[PDB]
C-alpha cells in the first residue's frame, strides 16, 4: 500500500490531464477502439432507434504515466480513476435520445510501460433507418458511428 | 410583488388553453410545525379551454 | 509534449485568466459571437406533443485576447485544444426549447488559435416547441 | 465526542490514507470481500420488458488494515 501511495504521488506530481500525451508533437496517439456488446436492449421500429448496452474498449499509450516496477515493490499495474488522466473524447456521431460520450467513467487500468486500458459501460440510443418491406421476416442494418470529436487524424488515430 | 399581473411578454401560445387571468396574491400564514409567520405569494392561473377539438 | 502542457498551463493559469470575465478590451467594446447551425439529422417531429427533435452541431466562434501566445516561444504551435469548461463561453442556448434543456449535450474541446480565435463546435440534441399546422 | 472526532480525523487523514489504493498487504495479495444479498422485497417482475425490480440490502465485508 505504501508502494502504491508513493507511485501515485510520483505519477501525478506534475501531470496535466488537459494535454495530449505524446513526447513529441508530431506523434499520433494510437487508440485501439473496440466494442463488446452486453445486450441489444431494444429496437424501436416506430421511432427508428436502437438501444444497446456496450462496453467501449479504448486503449492508448501515455508517455508520462510510466515507471519502473523495481523501484515500487514490483507494482506492474494500478487502477486509477479515469477522471485524473487524459482520455480520448470518442463520441457517438449518429446519436438520438441519448448521451454522446461515455458518462460512467469507471477506473482505468494503467500499466508500467505507459499503456492504459479503459472499458466503461454505456447505453447508446443510436439512430438507424428501418426497412419493414418483409415484416415480420425483415432483417435490419443499424449502424453506430464512433470517432474522435476534436482531434483530427494527425493527432489521434483509431485502430 | 414585483407586479400583480404575471408577465406574458414572451409567452408561447399553446393553442389549447388561453390565460384568462393570472395575478399573484400575497398571503401570510402560520404552520403547526413552527412558531413563526411565513409569507408567500400564490399565483392563480385562470385558463379557459378552447373547445373546438374536443367539441 | 512538455511544450504543449506548458502552454496549456500558462493559458488557463487561474492567477492570470478568470473564465467569469468577458474578454472585452474596452468598456463600451462588446464581444462578437458568430453562429452557425449544422443540421446533422431531423430525429422526429411529434405532432401530438408539438415538439421537433433535431441533432445539430452549433458552431460558435469569438475572440478571446487573453488566450494568445507567441508561436516562436512555444515550439511554433499554432493552435491548441482547451476544455470548453475552463474558458469563458458565451452562454448561447436554445431559448424556445420544449423540455427544459438549454445547453449543448457534450461540451467538447475548443480549438484555440494562437491569435485568440476560439472555434467551438459542440453537438446537441435539441427539443424545440413547434406550432404544428394540421389543416 | 472529542475522542471520536479525533479518531475520525486521524483515520481519514488524506496525508496517510488514500482511498484509491487497494488495502493489499503481505505483498502481491488480494483482498477477500464477503457478499450476502438480503432480499427485502420483490417490487415487481415485468414480463413485457423482462425486468425484475428488487429491493435488496447488499452486505459487503472486507478487512482494511489501514483503518486500525
Ligand atoms: C519530433 O519528430 C520530428 C519528426 O520526426 C523530429 O524532426 C524532431 O526532432 C522530433 N523532436 C523530438 C523532441 O523528438
Ligand atoms: C449494412 O449497411 C452498411 C452501411 O450502410 C453497408 O456497408 C453494408 O453493406 C450493409 N449490410 C448489408 C448486409 O446490407
Ligand atoms: C473541431 C471540432 O470540434 O470539430 C467537430 C466536428 N467534427 C467531429 C466533424 C470534426
Ligand atoms: Ca421493438
Please state the domain extents for chain C: 1-135
Partners of residue D37 on adjacent β-strands: D58
Distances (CA, A) of A73 to A8, A69, C111, D15, D65: 13, 6, 42, 21, 19
Q: What residue of A is the nearest CA neighbor of D65?
A: A1
DSSP string, chain D: -HHHHHHHHHHH-TTT--TTS----SSS-----EEEEEEEEEEEEETTTTEEEEEEEEEEE---GGG-
D22-48 as b/e: b if 16+ CB within 10 A: eeeeeeeeeeeeeeeeeeeeeeeeeee
Fold that domain A1-159 belongs to in CATH: Acetylcholine Binding Protein; Chain: A, (2.70.170)
Distances (CA, A) of C89 to C8, D27, D57: 17, 50, 45
Choose the mutation target among C98, C128, C131, C133 for the interface with B, i.e. most B CBs under 10 Å.
C131
Which cell is D4 given?
471520536
Q: Do D66 and A5 touch (CB under 8 A)?
A: no
CB-based contacts of D43: which residues, under 8 Å, 6+ apart?
Answer: D53, D54, D55
d(CA C56, CA C121): 10
C66: helix, strand or coil: helix
Dihedral angle sign, alpha carbons of residues C62, C67, C73, C77: negative
Question: Do residues A55 and A38 touch, judged by C-beta distance below 8 A?
Answer: yes
d(CA A128, CA A94): 8
Give the torsion through C-alpha atoms of C20, C23, C29, C30, to 10 deg: -70
d(CA B19, CA B48): 6
CB-based contacts of C105: which residues, under 8 Å, 6+ apart?
Answer: A99, A100, C122, C123, C124, C125
Question: Do residues B4 and B24 touch, judged by C-beta distance below 8 A?
Answer: yes
A92: helix, strand or coil: strand
A2: helix, strand or coil: helix
CB atoms within 10 A of CB C47: 12
Q: May I ask the CATH architecture of the domain C1-135? A: Distorted Sandwich (2.70)
- Flag whether C touches D (3+ CB pairs, 8 A cutoff): no
Give, using CA atoms, the residue closest to atom 9 of ligand 1: A24
Q: What residue of C is the nearest CA neighbor of A89?
A: C108
Q: Do A18 and C55 touch (CB under 8 A)?
A: no
Nearest of A61, A77, A58, A62 to residue A120 by alpha carbon: A58
Identify the residues whose C-beta falls under 6 Å from ligand 1.
Answer: A 24, 26
Question: Do residues A128 and A48 touch, judged by C-beta distance below 8 A?
Answer: yes
Place of cell 474498449: A57
Task: Tell me how the structure was determined.
Answer: cryo-EM
Which stretches of chain C are assigned E, i.e. beta strand? 34-46, 51-63, 79-83, 109-113, 117-120, 123-129
Query: Residue C1 carries which DSSP code?
Result: -
Distances (CA, A) of C53 to A107, A142, C44, C79: 34, 20, 5, 34
Which cell is A6 given?
508513493
Q: Do D21 and A4 touch (CB under 8 A)?
A: yes
d(CA B46, CA A132): 48
Between the CA of B52 and the centroid of ligand 3 the distance, in Å, is 48
Query: Residue C3 carries which DSSP code?
Result: H
A137: helix, strand or coil: coil
CB atoms within 10 A of CB A105: 13
Which cell is A66 given?
510510466
Report the residue among A26, A28, A63, A154 best suited for mutation to probe ligand 1: largest number of ligand atoms under 8 A from its CB: A26
Q: What residue of C is the nearest CA neighbor of A27?
A: C1
Give yes or no for C55 touching A (CB within 8 A): yes
Between the CA of B5 and the centroid of ligand 1 the distance, in Å, is 69
A68-80 as b/e: b if 16+ CB within 10 A: eeeebeebeebeb
* Ligand-binding site membership of A45 (annotated): yes
Amino acid at each position: 500500500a505504501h508502494a502504491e501511495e508513493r507511485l501515485l504521488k510520483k505519477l501525478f506530481s506534475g501531470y496535466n490531464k488537459w494535454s495530449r500525451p505524446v513526447a513529441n508533437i508530431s506523434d499520433v496517439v494510437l487508440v485501439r477502439f473496440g466494442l463488446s456488446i452486453a445486450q441489444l436492449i431494444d429496437v424501436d421500429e416506430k421511432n427508428q432507434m436502437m438501444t444497446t448496452n456496450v462496453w467501449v474498449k479504448q486503449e492508448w499509450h501515455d508517455y508520462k504515466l510510466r515507471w519502473d516496477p523495481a523501484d515500487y515493490e514490483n507494482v506492474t499495474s494500478i487502477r486509477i480513476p479515469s477522471e485524473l488522466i487524459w482520455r480520448p473524447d470518442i463520441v457517438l456521431y449518429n446519436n438520438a435520445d441519448g448521451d454522446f460520450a461515455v458518462t460512467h467513467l469507471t477506473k482505468a487500468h494503467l500499466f508500467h510501460d505507459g499503456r492504459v486500458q479503459w472499458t466503461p459501460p454505456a447505453i447508446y440510443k443510436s439512430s438507424c433507418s428501418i426497412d419493414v418491406t418483409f415484416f415480420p421476416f425483415d432483417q435490419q442494418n443499424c449502424t453506430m458511428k464512433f470517432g474522435s470529436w476534436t482531434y483530427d487524424k494527425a493527432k489521434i488515430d483509431l485502430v | 410583488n414585483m407586479h400583480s399581473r404575471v408577465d406574458q411578454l414572451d409567452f408561447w401560445e399553446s393553442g389549447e388553453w388561453v390565460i384568462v387571468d393570472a395575478v399573484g396574491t400575497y398571503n401570510t400564514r402560520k404552520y403547526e410545525c413552527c412558531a413563526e409567520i411565513y409569507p408567500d405569494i400564490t399565483y392563480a392561473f385562470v385558463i379557459r379551454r378552447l373547445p373546438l377539438f374536443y367539441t | 509534449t512538455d511544450t504543449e502542457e506548458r502552454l496549456v498551463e500558462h493559458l488557463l493559469d487561474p492567477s492570470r485568466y478568470n473564465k467569469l470575465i468577458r474578454p472585452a478590451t474596452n468598456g463600451s467594446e462588446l464581444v462578437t459571437v458568430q453562429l452557425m447551425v449544422s443540421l446533422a439529422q431531423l430525429i422526429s417531429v411529434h405532432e401530438r406533443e408539438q415538439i421537433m427533435t433535431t441533432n445539430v452541431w452549433l458552431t460558435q466562434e469569438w475572440e478571446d485576447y487573453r488566450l494568445t501566445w507567441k508561436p516562436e516561444e512555444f515550439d511554433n504551435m499554432k493552435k491548441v485544444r482547451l476544455p470548453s469548461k475552463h474558458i469563458w463561453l458565451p452562454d448561447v442556448v436554445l431559448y424556445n426549447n420544449a423540455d427544459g434543456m438549454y445547453e449543448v449535450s457534450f461540451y467538447s474541446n475548443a480549438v484555440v488559435s494562437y491569435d485568440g480565435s476560439i472555434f467551438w463546435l459542440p453537438p446537441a440534441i435539441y427539443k424545440s416547441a413547434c406550432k404544428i399546422e394540421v389543416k
